[PDB]
Design an enzyme around this catalytic site. Structure first.
Site, PDB file in Angstrom:
ATOM      1  N   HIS A   1       0.853  -1.196   0.000  1.00 56.85           N
ATOM      2  CA  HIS A   1       0.000   0.000   0.000  1.00 56.85           C
ATOM      3  C   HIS A   1       0.882   1.235   0.000  1.00 56.85           C
ATOM      4  CE1 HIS A   1      -3.638  -2.340   0.808  1.00 56.85           C
ATOM      5  NE2 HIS A   1      -2.906  -3.057   1.646  1.00 56.85           N
TER       6      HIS A   1
ATOM      7  N   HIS B   1      -3.773  14.596  -1.510  1.00 58.29           N
ATOM      8  CA  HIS B   1      -4.042  15.677  -2.499  1.00 58.29           C
ATOM      9  C   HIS B   1      -3.567  17.059  -1.982  1.00 58.29           C
ATOM     10  CE1 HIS B   1      -7.473  13.636  -5.032  1.00 58.29           C
ATOM     11  NE2 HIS B   1      -6.349  12.929  -5.029  1.00 58.29           N
TER      12      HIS B   1
ATOM     13  N   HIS C   1      -5.668   9.182  -0.361  1.00 59.97           N
ATOM     14  CA  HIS C   1      -6.051   7.822  -0.777  1.00 59.97           C
ATOM     15  C   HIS C   1      -4.806   7.006  -1.072  1.00 59.97           C
ATOM     16  CE1 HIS C   1      -5.512   8.628  -5.206  1.00 59.97           C
ATOM     17  NE2 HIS C   1      -6.017   9.813  -4.924  1.00 59.97           N
ATOM     18  N   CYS C   2      -4.972   5.682  -0.996  1.00 59.03           N
ATOM     19  CA  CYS C   2      -3.985   4.754  -1.544  1.00 59.03           C
ATOM     20  C   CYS C   2      -3.890   4.839  -3.055  1.00 59.03           C
ATOM     21  CB  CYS C   2      -4.336   3.338  -1.058  1.00 59.03           C
ATOM     22  SG  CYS C   2      -3.066   2.127  -1.493  1.00 59.03           S
TER      23      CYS C   2
ATOM     24  N   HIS D   1      -7.684  -0.176  -4.994  1.00 58.40           N
ATOM     25  CA  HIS D   1      -7.482   0.140  -3.538  1.00 58.40           C
ATOM     26  C   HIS D   1      -8.456   1.239  -3.083  1.00 58.40           C
ATOM     27  CE1 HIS D   1      -3.531  -2.042  -2.479  1.00 58.40           C
ATOM     28  NE2 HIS D   1      -3.905  -2.467  -3.676  1.00 58.40           N
TER      29      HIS D   1
ATOM     30  N   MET E   1      -9.926   2.602   0.622  1.00 57.87           N
ATOM     31  CA  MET E   1      -8.641   3.049   1.153  1.00 57.87           C
ATOM     32  C   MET E   1      -8.461   4.532   0.859  1.00 57.87           C
ATOM     33  SD  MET E   1      -5.122   0.904   1.407  1.00 57.87           S
ATOM     34  CE  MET E   1      -3.902   1.489   2.549  1.00 57.87           C
TER      35      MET E   1
ATOM     36  N   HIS F   1     -27.159  17.065   0.379  1.00 62.00           N
ATOM     37  CA  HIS F   1     -28.312  17.876   0.733  1.00 62.00           C
ATOM     38  C   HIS F   1     -28.690  17.545   2.194  1.00 62.00           C
ATOM     39  CE1 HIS F   1     -32.203  19.976   0.184  1.00 62.00           C
ATOM     40  NE2 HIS F   1     -32.777  18.948   0.778  1.00 62.00           N
TER      41      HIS F   1
ATOM     42  N   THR G   1     -28.489  22.190  -2.418  1.00 60.46           N
ATOM     43  CA  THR G   1     -27.783  20.990  -2.770  1.00 60.46           C
ATOM     44  C   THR G   1     -26.460  21.498  -3.374  1.00 60.46           C
ATOM     45  OG1 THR G   1     -29.840  19.807  -3.170  1.00 60.46           O
ATOM     46  CG2 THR G   1     -27.866  18.873  -4.132  1.00 60.46           C
TER      47      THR G   1
ATOM     48  N   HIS H   1     -28.216  13.657  -3.077  1.00 57.50           N
ATOM     49  CA  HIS H   1     -29.517  13.938  -3.713  1.00 57.50           C
ATOM     50  C   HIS H   1     -29.701  13.348  -5.122  1.00 57.50           C
ATOM     51  CE1 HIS H   1     -33.446  15.767  -4.158  1.00 57.50           C
ATOM     52  NE2 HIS H   1     -33.353  16.352  -2.971  1.00 57.50           N
TER      53      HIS H   1
END
Ligand SMILES: [Cl-]
Ligand SMILES: [Cl-]
Ligand SMILES: [Cl-]
Ligand SMILES: [Cu+2]
Ligand SMILES: [Cu+2]
Ligand SMILES: [Cu+2]
Ligand SMILES: [Cu+2]
Ligand SMILES: [Cu+2]
Ligand SMILES: [Cu+2]
Lengths: 336, 336, 335
Positions: free
Chosen positions: C92, C97, C132-133, C142, C147, C252, C277, C303
């Site tokens: 892994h 980000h 995330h992985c 993954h 993950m 929402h 929304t 929604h």
């Protein structure tokens, strides 16, 4: 206004270049309004979209999927010479989202094989805009066979952020994203056909499921990877223009950000900042501005990661320069 | 504020009209807060949605898909009389996304056939908002059988751009977009049923694939085309309210733009400008403001062009006036 | 920042908590830049995701789907110790980000079972961000096995509206939304597999249809309903962080609004206001700020109402306090 005043204006002929590159242009407009001229030949042609040899009958502005990017400034006139060679089998036309009236030019540009047309429009609104073919009765089918591209209408004073300050890019790339709908036979193997016409009924069936079989940048899986990777340097300021004529996408630069993103693609709407992943709806273009700070390989993806890594929507950037340990450092390398 | 203060307010009874038209109203509010009164009867009824005779069991506010647009001003009270006649078979209620508390009014308005209810709420937030039925355990089924519409809560001072310039429309049109999930048999033909209850299990199976069979405006393929075209003239300022209670859409005017678009539909959020294609998420309404500059036929579409041209999501505007040659011109008509 | 300067920054170890709760933090940063240290262990484990006993082999940061929320302030350094225990079967890594460089840290954190790593990055941009992985050649697998999580990088001065007015929340909740792609046999029954790698070919086949079997908050249908509903009172200010690492969502609050929504998740982009929304694209996190005005049960949903009520994307808030008849009242009860 007057047809006589428009005849008085300077002319400027441009040679187009194939995506992801963009023809020479200046960011700041030198002088007043111009009539900028382009020519494109339409080609219907077999293209190979993946390593298995899957085939599509593409309908390509200037021979490429996507069609090339045209650059003009706000209040220029764009003048297109559009040629449908007699070797083609279908009628085509062009709709510019940038233009006002006559279905974006589509009602005035219907050309059969062997025909040509010249259209002029005034680029009244600054931004990046999709163009595509749209023949009555056949609109989705020509768009999803690759018949789409983008234009950029720069403000006359060049790009600015939300608060007045100049944004000058060092380089610009155009990534055209394409959803393809390739029919499968009884055994789940992609079908092949002789002429585009024969693929019609089978492709419409795949289209109605709303599920593409492939989603690619620049016409093919891996077209912008390996030694076809886009390139930049640490400290370089890059504009990435991205379009999708039919379906939503969510671009993301893995290892980077979009520093300024015009996600609606319109330069009078102020950009979002510091974006991880932005969103471009089907039928729009967007643009993202980034200054690279780290060297190495980046991946540029549609962040539906199934569409990126299974369906083909991933490109590479290779960035040269020195590593910055302040931004990121491996304190302990993987160890037992 | 107090019950007594509310009891002192003038009342105003409003007669609803069928979409795409909108009841008489004033843009700038005439005087102080009012209690605005509306009455809707719910009708369950079979509708035919395409030229092949495809039927849906619609559950329709005031007998139309979508239900009618209600207009109030910020800080009015909306007082709704909701009626479920004995001729119906199901319980229904209403959730206004414009309202605060009890599940948008849903928890206070559950009415069996033979019952009525009166709901009052304060319209505290300006914008266009979705309303829809939402019976416990049965929410999506009622929503994708057509039981939704929109309200518009105008600012008391009317509309304004992002920096205070007033925006007055000459015309307003309400476009309600609906995804339908029509079951097929083993042989590909759409099934018919003799009551709404009988379609339930089969429809749920279709719904779970997330792929609509039809995506339409105003209840049917071609509802707003040809001779039911929405009309304007060159120079007119038009407001297009668009809703989708369930699934995303990306409105585009072919040949035009959204000059000002409240894509989120909320008037305290500054509009985007010069939009080619805007995005409205499922469960929201948005509004686009545009001044026609060119006469002729315009198509208004969801720019997933498969949904627009194969599934039904296309409307027409017929626009009168004279052609502007400065904006666009055919330099060389199609020719060999 | 000299090398000496970075070296002498204060260090702070933070103990993580499971979603939808968030570890203790201050909105306004107290003091100057710090190195904030977190540790997470990766667990591959079978989880039950619906009331029919459907199982998935989850790949879980810290044992949960989603991974926990980590909170630092702008210009803090985040230093993560990431452990892959010997009992797991797969390599892994992690891609923040929020981070700049080496694929978000994915090129520097590839750990086999039996290995650990420590990554440090500077949090230069304020916002909520997905992590995330992302192992080479197997990224989506993954991610859609759960993950993924999110971090929040708060401005040094706390949250503000467009006008520069301070926004201070009383409560924060983290809602992680997950699309699952569970194979079925020819009878229509969900399949069960011995080891994660056994499910691979069948799962990629479902993935390619682009149609999830389940869309859930916090790892299962009903995880945040009933006795596990989120709580607030009339008058409290609530921040709802929401993430989706792979697929679009449109949150929402049924009965409520997003008073301020940073829909793109990035606090230097002014928020949208009065939202019904809002839309979070796949690969992003978003945040909505709301002051509850009325008591009762609220539902918080994706929604697309088929995804909410048929596939699992529905949570509850229980809100205590007194009813406001000005805002809403039943003039005539059903009769
Ligand atoms: Cl990624
Ligand atoms: Cl179009
Ligand atoms: Cl709802
Ligand atoms: Cu064509
Ligand atoms: Cu178009
Ligand atoms: Cu109903
Ligand atoms: Cu709703
Ligand atoms: Cu992993
Ligand atoms: Cu990512």
């Amino acid at each position: 206004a007057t047809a006589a005043e428009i005849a008085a204006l300077p002319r400027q002929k441009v040679e187009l270049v194939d995506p992801p590159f963009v023809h020479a242009h200046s960011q700041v407009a030198e002088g007043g309004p111009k009539v900028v001229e382009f020519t494109m030949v339409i080609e219907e042609k077999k293209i190979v979209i993946d390593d298995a040899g899957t085939e599509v009958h593409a309908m390509a502005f200037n021979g490429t999927v996507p069609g090339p990017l045209m650059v003009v400034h706000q209040d220029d006139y764009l003048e297109l010479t559009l040629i449908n060679p007699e070797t083609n089998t279908l009628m085509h036309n062009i709709d510019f989202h940038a233009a006002t009236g006559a279905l974006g030019g589509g009602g005035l540009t219907e050309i059969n094989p062997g025909e040509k047309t010249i259209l002029r429009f005034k680029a009244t609104k600054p931004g990046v805009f999709v163009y595509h073919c749209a023949p009555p009765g056949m609109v989705p089918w020509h768009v999803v066979s690759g018949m789409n591209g983008a234009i950029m209408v720069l403000p006359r004073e060049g790009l600015h952020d939300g608060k007045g300050k100049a944004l000058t890019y060092d380089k610009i790339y155009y990534v055209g994203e394409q959803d393809f709908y390739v029919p499968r036979d009884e055994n789940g193997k992609y079908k092949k056909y002789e002429a585009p016409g024969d693929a019609y009924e089978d492709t419409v069936k795949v289209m109605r499921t709303l599920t593409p079989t492939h989603v690619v940048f620049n016409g093919a899986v891996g077209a912008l990877t390996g030694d076809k990777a886009m390139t930049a340097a640490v400290g370089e300021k890059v504009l990435i223009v991205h379009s999708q004529a039919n379906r939503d996408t969510r671009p993301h630069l893995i290892g980077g950000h979009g520093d300024y993103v015009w996600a609606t693609g319109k330069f009078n709407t102020p950009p979002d900042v510091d974006q991880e992943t932005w969103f471009i709806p089907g039928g729009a273009a967007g643009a993202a501005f980034y200054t690279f700070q780290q060297p190495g390989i980046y991946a540029y993806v549609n962040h539906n990661l199934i569409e990126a890594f299974e369906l083909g929507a991933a490109a590479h950037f290779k960035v040269t320069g020195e590593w910055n340990d302040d931004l990121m450092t491996s304190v302990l390398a993987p160890s037992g």
